[PDB]
Design a protein around this ligand. Structure first.
Ligand SMILES: [Zn+2]
Length: 7
């Protein structure tokens, strides 16, 4: 699966 971190 793809991951996205929005800090
Ligand atoms: Zn993955």
């Amino acid at each position: 699966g793809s991951n996205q971190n929005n800090f």
